[PDB]
Amino acid sequence: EVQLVESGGGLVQPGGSLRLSCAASGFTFSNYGIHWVRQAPGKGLEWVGWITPDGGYTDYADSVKGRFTISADTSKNTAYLQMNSLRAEDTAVYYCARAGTLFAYWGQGTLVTVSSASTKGPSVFPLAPSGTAALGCLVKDYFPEPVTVSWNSGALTSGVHTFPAVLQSSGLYSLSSVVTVPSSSLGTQTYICNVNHKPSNTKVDKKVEPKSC
Amino acid sequence: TCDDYYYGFGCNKFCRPRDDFFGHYACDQNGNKTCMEGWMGPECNRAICRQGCSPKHGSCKLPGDCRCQYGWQGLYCDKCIPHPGCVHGICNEPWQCLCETNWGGQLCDKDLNYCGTHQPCLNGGTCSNTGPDKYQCSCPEGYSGPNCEI
Amino acid sequence: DIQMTQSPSSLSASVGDRVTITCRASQDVSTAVAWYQQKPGKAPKLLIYSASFLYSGVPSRFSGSGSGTDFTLTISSLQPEDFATYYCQQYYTTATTFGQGTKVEIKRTVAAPSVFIFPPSDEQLKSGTASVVCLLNNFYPREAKVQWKVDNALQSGNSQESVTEQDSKDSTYSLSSTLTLSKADYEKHKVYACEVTHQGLSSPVTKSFNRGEC
C-alpha cells in the first residue's frame, strides 16, 4: 500500500536552514509527484509547493518562494524540501502528499520549530494515587515539541489521558499524562510511564508507586 | 537554447506540468504531456476507471474507482437494480421485475399456480388458476363460497 | 490566488443531528472542490472529492453538494467520533487553496467530573520546584471553573490549565490544572485546595491535602 513518511523536522535557529525528506513506497514514484502542505500551530492548511519526479519541474507559494527549494530522487523514491532563511512564520507541521490523487494520500507529518531557544530533555515525575483510583506522570520542562507518553509499554490505553503541552513562563513545555485504574489493582499490578522526547534523545520509564510516608 | 516550458526543434512546443481540475501530467523533453498513473485524455483531466467499468452506466473522477448511476450496481457497474422488493423476477433495465415461469405481477410475488401451491378449494371443490394469486373454486352440491367452505 | 471561506467557524451538535458546513470560493471553481476531516495531531483525511463524490471508506453519512462558487458538506446523522476541524479545498489551480476550517463539537447530557488532587512528588521537590496537579476527569460541558486556594488564599497567575480533545465514544473532556511554585514557596504553606465548579456538580467540589501528610 501507498506509504508517505516525512523525516528531518526539528528545532532550527531563526534565519537558519533545514532539509525535510518524504520517503514514498507502495507505488511507481516516477508516475506521480509530491506536494508539500504545512500547518502552523492553531492555524489552517497551507500549500508550500510541488515536484514532478519526471522532468524535475517545481512550483511554490509566494510565501515560500526564493527561500524554499523542492527536489526529488526516483532511485530513492524520496522527495526533499530545503528550507532556507527561516522566519518564525515557517514553524508548522510539514506534510507531504502524492500528486494525481486529489490529496487522498498524506504522510503523518514532521514538526519544524523555528526558535532561538535551546533543546531540553524533560524530567519525569510520578503522580501517586491515594473502588476507582487515578495516577499519572508529570513530564516537566522540555523543548521543543513533541513528547510521546505511553503506559505499560503500549499495553495500557483504556482510561489514559495525555494532556496537550502548555508553554510555561520559562519558554519550556510541560504536560501531564493520567490513567484511571481500579484501587484493588494497585500494588498487585504495576504502572510505568514510557516518556520519549526524540529532539533531546530522552527515554524515561518512571514507575508510579503509592507512598505511605 | 529553450526557455522554461518550451521544447522541440525551434522551442515552439509549450508544456508546463499540472496537478489540478485541468490536468494531472508532467512534461517530456519533446514538449508532450505525460499523464500521471491513472489519468487519461490529451490533457489528463479524465480518470482511468476500474478495469471493466461500464462506459454507459459507470463513471470516474478518481482512479481506479467505478461509481454507479441510480439503478445500477456491481464492481463493473453493469448489473441493474430490480424494483423493490422484487421477488421471483429479474431486470434488463433499472427498477424492472420480469417474472419467470410462472409468477406475476409487478413484484413477481403473486402465484400463477395458486391451486397447485395452496389448494384453496375445500369440501371437494375444483381449483383452476385465473391469474396472479387468483383462482376459481367450482363447488359440489351443498357447498358455496369462494373456497366451498359454506 | 483563489480564496476558500468556510461558514460557520465552529458548531456544537448532538448525536443524530444534521450538520451543514458551507464554503465559498472567491472565483468560479466548477466541481474542483474537496472536503477533509482533521483530528488534532493527525493528517487531514479526504471525505468528498469532485464536490459530490464520496471517497472510499468514508461513512455514507458524509455527503457534499455545490458547483461554481458555493459548496456545502453534510453529516446527515452526527456521530461521537465526528469531532474535528473540517476543511474545504479548491483544486481548480495546482497551487491548492484551503478554507480556514470548521470545528465540530459534540453536545451530550451533563456529566459531573471526578476530581483528583496530586501533591508534588519528593523527586520534583529534590530538583527545586513543586507542581500541584488537579485532575477533572470525564466531564461535559467543557465550561469548568478551577480555583486554587492555598491556606484559604485564592491563587492567581501561578496555575495553567490543559484540556483533552473530546472522547470518540462518550464525548467527554478531561482537564488538568497545574499550580507551580518553588520548593521554598511550597514549604511556606499547609493546605493546598482545588475548588471545582461545574454544571454536573450541585455545589463546588474541593479536593485538598496537607503538605508532608499522607
Where exactly are the structural domains of chain B? 1-150
Contact at CB, B36 and A57, closer than 8 angstroms = no
CA distance C44 to C85: 9
Chain B CB contacts of A60 under 8 Å are none
Contact at CB, A57 and B34, closer than 8 angstroms = no
> Which SS3 state, helix, strand or coil, does residue A59 take?
strand
CA distance C134 to C142: 16
C194 to chain A, any CB pair closer than 8 A? The answer is no
A32 to chain C, any CB pair closer than 8 A? The answer is no
Nearest 5°: phi and psi at A105? -110, 115
Pairing of the two strands C159-163 and C173-182 = antiparallel
Residue A145 near residue A137, CB atoms below 8 Å: no
Compute CA B91 distance to the chain's CA centroid, rounded to the nearest angstrom. 9
CA angle C56, C105, A155 (to 5 degrees): 70
B17, B38, B62 ranked by CB distance to A52: nearest:
B17
Cell digits of residue B11? 522551442
A209 to chain C, any CB pair closer than 8 A? The answer is no
Pairing of the two strands A3-7 and A18-25 = antiparallel
Between the alpha carbon of residue C44 and those of residues A94, C20, C87, C193, the distances in Å are 12, 19, 8, 42
| Residues in a beta bridge with C148 | C194
CA distance B68 to B62: 13
Residue C66 CB coordination number (10 Å) = 22
Residue A160 near residue C174, CB atoms below 8 Å: no
CA distance C64 to A101: 18
Residue B37 near residue B64, CB atoms below 8 Å: no
Nearest to B11 by CA among B22, B20, B2, B21: B2
Contact at CB, B62 and A32, closer than 8 angstroms = no
> Which SS3 state, helix, strand or coil, does residue A38 take?
strand
| Residues in a beta bridge with C130 | C181
For chain A, the first-to-last Cα distance in angstroms comes to 55
CA distance B91 to B110: 17
> Which SS3 state, helix, strand or coil, does residue A82 take?
strand
Tell me the nearest-neighbour CA distance from B14 into chain A, angstroms.
14
Contact at CB, A109 and C164, closer than 8 angstroms = no
3-state per-residue secondary structure call for chain C: CCCEEEECCEEEECCCCCEEEEEEECCCCCCCEEEEEECCCCCCEEEEECCCEECCCCCCCEEEEECCCEEEEEECCCCHHHCEEEEEEECCCCCCEECCCEEEEECCCCECCEEEEECCCHHHHHCCEEEEEEEEEEEECCCEEEEEEECCEECCCCEEEEECCCCCCCCCEEEEEEEEEEHHHHHCCCEEEEEEEECCCCCCEEEEEECCCC
Nearest to B62 by CA among C31, C145, C141, C104: C31
Chain B CB contacts of A55 under 8 Å are 17, 26-29
CA angle C36, C38, C39 (to 5 degrees): 155
Nearest to A80 by CA among A8, A2, A12: A8
Residue A89 CB coordination number (10 Å) = 10
Q: After which residues is chain C broken (C to N over 2.5 A)?
A: none
Q: What single-letter DSSP state applies at residue A212?
A: -
DSSP run (H or E) holding B116 = helix B114-118
Between the alpha carbon of residue A23 and those of residues B68, B84, B86, the distances in Å are 35, 50, 52
Residue C106 near residue C122, CB atoms below 8 Å: no
Fold of C109-214: Immunoglobulin-like (2.60.40)
CA distance A187 to A112: 42
CA angle C1, C3, C7 (to 5 degrees): 175
Cell digits of residue A160? 489514559
Tell me the nearest-neighbour CA distance from C5 into chain A, angstroms.
12
**CA Rg, chain B, in Å?**
32
A168 to chain C, any CB pair closer than 8 A? The answer is yes
Q: Does the structural domain C1-108 have CATH classification 2.60.40.10?
A: yes
CA distance B101 to B32: 60
Q: What resolution in angstroms does the PDB record give? A: 2.6
What lies within 8 Å, CB to CB, of A137 at 6+ separation is A124, A125, A126, A127, A149, A176, A177, A193, A195, A206, A208
CA distance C69 to C29: 6
Contact at CB, C92 and B65, closer than 8 angstroms = no
Contact at CB, B36 and A27, closer than 8 angstroms = no
Contact at CB, B20 and C92, closer than 8 angstroms = yes
B21, B65, B67 ranked by CB distance to C30: nearest:
B21
Minimum Cα–Cα distance from B59: chain C residue: C53
Contact at CB, C174 and A178, closer than 8 angstroms = yes
Given CA atoms C61, C64, C65, C69 in this order, what sign does their dihedral have? positive
Residue A149 near residue A118, CB atoms below 8 Å: no
Domains of chain A, CATH where assigned? 1-116 (2.60.40.10), 117-213 (2.60.40.10)
B65 to chain C, any CB pair closer than 8 A? The answer is yes
DSSP string, A109-147: -EEEEE-SSPPBPPEEEEE----EEEEEEEEEEEBSS--
Residue A114 near residue A126, CB atoms below 8 Å: no
CA distance A129 to A182: 11
Residue A108 near residue C90, CB atoms below 8 Å: no
Cell digits of residue A82? 530545503
Nearest to A200 by CA among A143, A137, A139, A140: A143
Helix and strand numbers (H, E) in chain A are 0, 18
> How is chain C split into domains, by residue range?
1-108, 109-214
A184 to chain C, any CB pair closer than 8 A? The answer is no
> Which SS3 state, helix, strand or coil, does residue A63 take?
coil
Nearest to C161 by CA among C185, C187, C184, C143: C143
C129 to chain A, any CB pair closer than 8 A? The answer is yes
Scanning the structure block, which residue is given the C-alpha cell 481500579? A182
Chain B CB contacts of A101 under 8 Å are 62
B18, B21, B62 ranked by CB distance to C32: nearest:
B21
Residue A143 CB coordination number (10 Å) = 23
